[PDB]
């Protein structure tokens, strides 16, 4: 909107000069997914443009080690976006770059290289992957000092309408941000969880994907705290009421074409399709933990009639872990249904995409569909189906990623080893604490 | 004190017509090992030494089924106890009690009855156990409406005087009245933790002890309650501090000599404690679920520097998960230092009975003993040791125990699948709550 | 006071009897002066004197390790004592005893043997001591928990009367409880800071004034809290009021005469007193860190018009840190003001009674007596005369002691050790503290 | 921005007459780094500018006594700034003075002048300093009365984006009246501490420097303020989170030249970017009572892994005291990390030239860098390694300025007097002090 989107360099100094942009938020994507930001005046953009921007990495998790700390940020052009909400006047633009050490070699613990990686590896085999992702978050009231709360905004449910839902100009003026920042909104409603909303924007290749979900999460939270509001994506901050996922729709292209379509197939998909899907179905135990980062993500991945917890794949079902929508064509695309909105996007799309490439070159079977509804069978009968489970908890993602090659191999051993780590010292401190629950069930019998 | 031990039904007669004894609190304990008691007049006790109590075991979880659910309690004399907590004049007492079927057969379910089937099962063997338990308990403030808080009564530490500990006259009375009950004490102190307290009584065989057991968990919560306390038996109350365990000193008996000693050997333990200990360390993961029983269990059986998770054994060592106390001759014993004070006694006990004589059956060898300070060691050095580690939380432990064969054929199969099944549940029920940890750590990050 | 003081365990057993003596306070004192005690019934009591009483050491700072942490505590029957406090039917009492390793040798960490130690180095010399202390300390509010505070008593000063002393009825029920547990009271009266109060009780040998002193200590503090009120034996509790000190009055005898007295020297003071003035002056400040123990004493210990911080003798003079009372013939004695009364008696005392015996063996003259106010000297008229400065706080005490061979060899490695690495850990964790003073006066400003 | 730097007092005059200019601040630092500031009318500017501006410098801390305490403050012309939040119709300018006695004589007791003493020392040797200091301050809440707290803004980490970093628009005000008093700016972001922030302005000649820092503290304050928040520049105003440094970047420059490069060395350093770092190793303790110069900076000096306070030197390691950015060229440069942004720029820098000066003339040898992680390192890894520590507290720094007659002779008699007079009052104010800290430590227990 207002902005076309910038290529190149001169470009983007173009923009800088005609629509009075003064300060640029040089911005990257830390290693569990947070977005790490610093402004320079946009009289040194032309300078940051030629020899990066320096930084200290070891204040970064998962970054450089405090001996060795010095790192730069190389500015990606095609990044450049003015931000909406900030004023017009002196406009504060962002510009997403690559993490890259001082002798001049990209970073290997910077995701977006591990999603870059990826991307070269799917094009070896001239693949060039486009991911939809679907966020759900929630919008909370703030507390009198503009701190974030867990307080309903709505008691509204899934499409609800009227005073029900009561978060209409907020959605409004997220589209508008987004719209500005580039998106393509498709659709926005209230989701099934009270105070709890979906914004879809269009699909596209996976790495601007992936840079427009760290935008998304980071323009919608500032669109929220403007209007009084707080934007979670919290995979499941409330009990009993349903939590947040980012479904993952993916598709390959390879000259030109939908590589998961087969018109001459019964189920119009290819070959292709389904070791794409078998090789997710395979390797989805091991990158779990990072397709669910936290601690929380397993109290939103519970056995249920909510949760994706069981590996199975379908067409129509919901209650499978991948679904395939109906689209065909060059809209056909697969469904990944358990990541939610606090994983890493560039760790989380570059794991997926790995995943389907493996399932493509080593052949993959992805077994039958599950066209049943997974929630209401039980133990025995998903026994007898041969459908597994998801890890239940934290512990149990990171001890399947610890032993996993595949995981090691897509995400490069800094990312591998720090990602581990940082999660192995949350799930320490969070296993050692005494809930409230323990002493409301144990207190007064013990 | 004061009341001679009754043996037999005329003599528990007798006791209740010559100390005005009206009401008797008929009691039996549960799979859970929740103590469940109702009061009959002393009038109908010659007719409950002849025909049972009957009583309806639907509503006692564990017990049988609502389609038959007619039970019968069969007093036990020697259990005959006066409450001194309650009046002198119309004075009330206890009674414990079988659990048996109305076909007159024993209830398979019940957890003395599985203690007995130990008991008569080393006593195949020729064994005797008799067990010295150490049970820390911690004592809280009452609110207004006199129930349970978790708030301090003191901020003393470990063999603290003064009024740094302010519980001298609550251990005083809880004194007073075990000695009442029978009980022989031996010593009592303020504990490590701030309002944590131990109190020792002698040993016994492992029935009375596991009888003394629930009674000292009651008395102590009886004295506490009359003195506007709590007593927790809870095993991590407090994050932070200590934990309550239950050490669990075990010894052996052929013959009237302690099976456990040898004034031969250099380290004066005979070979049968090698193999009892042997027995007990090849055991402990597959009741671990048994020994420690709730989700809290495991917030105290964390690796740190308190807690007993490291499967060794040693002689003066307490990071060690078996300790043996340089006492010898008729003394020698073996603790184990991994329950806490909210398992069943009755269980626990068969357990480690059953352990150890397995162990002394099969002749296995516990391995050398660990002699450092496992706690200061690092996660490298155990693994080269070979030193395993217990379940780290209830989940874990429910699996480990749901394969064992070994404490299915100990508990029965009524007990092993009702106690599963209801730690499944509380499992179940845990493992969704979203904590205020998660809301802390997790909502203004996400 | 109604009981006289039993020499042997069969008089302790009597007494024990003939009082109706129910429970007893097994005691020691770990290595930074704090009393530990735990309860046994006095049936035990004959097996106690025996085979000691068995206890954790791990637990007891400054103590054994959690490798090899049995300990037993060997008795000392000539130390029993009932509390007045408690109740006279199944009455209380204390008995104090020695720590020993279970292979039967003394430990050597504990700080009555260190005492002991000293006693028997001043016995080879033909010397026994005599200590006389002067315990100062504060009588604060008591919460509505129950907790200490420093919330004033009285507005009164020193030797105040009438409502301006309002702590005359807890001095008089701490006298009477004092004359119970075998103290022989000499004076008592409110001190110069408000709610300050001193009980001055008569001299005796070192092992009984040490143990006098921790009975003395917890004696006051059980009296203030069934009164209702908290007794601080803080240094300096409150700020611009005077600090409690603990003055230790000493003297030494040989075949029953005096040492420090001779009739025919001009100030009736012998070369030996002398001596061992200079031994004082000369090692106090390489052991002020266990005289001065904790940070807040040197908030006690500041120079200025109260505290003895400048490192001279004198006779009349207060404002010395040795003090020699015009007392001549037995009661010929020296007084050391700089200890505070949260310091351990047993080391405290020992390291007085090892540098007065150096400096005798090793004839250190202890210099000019310093008679005029020192305090209103300033720094180059102490520098002209030499005058030296005690420690300014405690890390520079802890450097002192580090680098001392004295107190080294008059500890012994074990408690010279674990008492340097308590005090370095309470001064690293005060070290860091940002207090609110500097908030007062740097945060407006900065 | 908007107003070109004046040279001369004509282009002074000419700024006032055309920018509506009717107050001029007349501004010097006093010796402890306060700005002190009195308002004459523009009108009086040309008289001023002539005869100076007389004042009492007997309320001024470090400068002339009460009975000769008549000053003048002789303008600089090049200094003059109009100050962008004072209204702009009749706008209020600042002008920075030099300090001069009525007999036309220089204040020797003027920081200012003693930067200027050490330039003139650097241009007999042909040197000339340019220095980049990185200041860091917190945002804080200000109280009803608008009074500073330390109630934190926000909870945001380093390079922190969205809600969780609060003071976007306080940053954005403060660059643009940074820019408006002739800074450029560099970079701005949110610091590792909660509330905490860093705005990095371009380097420059050291006096020009000097003048920058005390405007940019001054400068920050008022902005902050009139957003309703408080800057605070105390070097670490809360306990847990880390401190705020003043990280002093220092090039030497000879015959336009960058002194520390050297193309023709493998490291790319000049043997006298050695020497002066050798210099500035070796001189670093005795002024480091300069570079921190109040009790709260120790509070941020602490042993840990956050605070440089180890005496070494490195290329990239920030856990070393001098750091060397890999910036070669006109761009070369030495980093000083100890000091905080409450120290006298005008002292410190002046004292940095003066250490590497001497480091230079002295040939002194910086000995080998330091490529370790020192924070990881022990105390006996760090001995062997000879790595020495910066005094631990603010009274081991005066002593350590005391015998410095390094220190002495570049600051001055008098300014070395008074500012360790000052010092020495701070301390001993400080010393006596009770903390809430030893309350909560020790009240309880002794
Ligand atoms: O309801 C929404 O999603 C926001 C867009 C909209 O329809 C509106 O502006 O009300
Ligand atoms: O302190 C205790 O454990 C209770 C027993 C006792 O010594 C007392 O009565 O005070
Ligand atoms: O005032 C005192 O020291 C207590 C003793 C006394 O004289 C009294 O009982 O009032
Ligand atoms: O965030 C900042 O440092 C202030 C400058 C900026 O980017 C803005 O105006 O938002």
Known sequence: ??????????????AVKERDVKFIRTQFTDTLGIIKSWAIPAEQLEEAFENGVMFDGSSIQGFTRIEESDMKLALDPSTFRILPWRPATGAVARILGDVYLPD??????????????????????????????????????????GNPTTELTDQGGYFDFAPLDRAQDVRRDIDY????????????????????????????????????????????????????????????????????????????????????????????????????????????????AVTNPV?????????????????????????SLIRIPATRGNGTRIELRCPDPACNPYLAFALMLRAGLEGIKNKIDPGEPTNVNIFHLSDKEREERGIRSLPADLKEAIDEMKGSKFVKEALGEHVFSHYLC????????????VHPWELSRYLSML
Chains 1, 2, 3, 4 share one sequence.
């Open 177 to 288: 941000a987004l719209e500005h920042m580039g998106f393509q909104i498709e659709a926005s409603h209230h989701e099934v969880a009270p105070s709890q909303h979906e914004i879809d924007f269009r699909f596209g290749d996976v790495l601007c994907t992936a840079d427009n979900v760290v935008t998304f999460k980071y323009v919608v939270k500032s669109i929220a705290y403007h209007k009084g509001y707080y934007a979670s994506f919290m995979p499941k901050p409330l009990f009993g009421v349903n939590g947040s996922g980012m479904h993952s729709n993916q598709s390959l292209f390879k000259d030109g074409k939908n590589v998961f379509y087969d018109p001459d197939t019964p189920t119009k998909l290819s070959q292709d399709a389904m070791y794409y899907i078998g090789g997710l179905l395979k390797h989805i135990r091991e990158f779990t």
């Open 104 to 145: 001049g070699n990209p970073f290997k613990g910077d995701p977006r290289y591990v999603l870059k990686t990826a991307i070269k590896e799917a094009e070896k085999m001239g693949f060039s992957m486009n991911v939809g992702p679907e966020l759900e978050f929630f919008l909370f009231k703030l507390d009198a000092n």
């Open 1 to 14: 909107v207002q902005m076309k989107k910038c290529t190149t360099k001169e470009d983007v100094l173009e």
């Open 295 to 319: 601690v929380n993500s397993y109290k939103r991945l519970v056995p249920g009639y909510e949760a994706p917890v069981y590996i199975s794949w379908s067409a129509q079902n919901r209650s």
């Open 422 to 433: 940082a999660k192995e010292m949350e799930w320490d401190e969070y296993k050692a604490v």
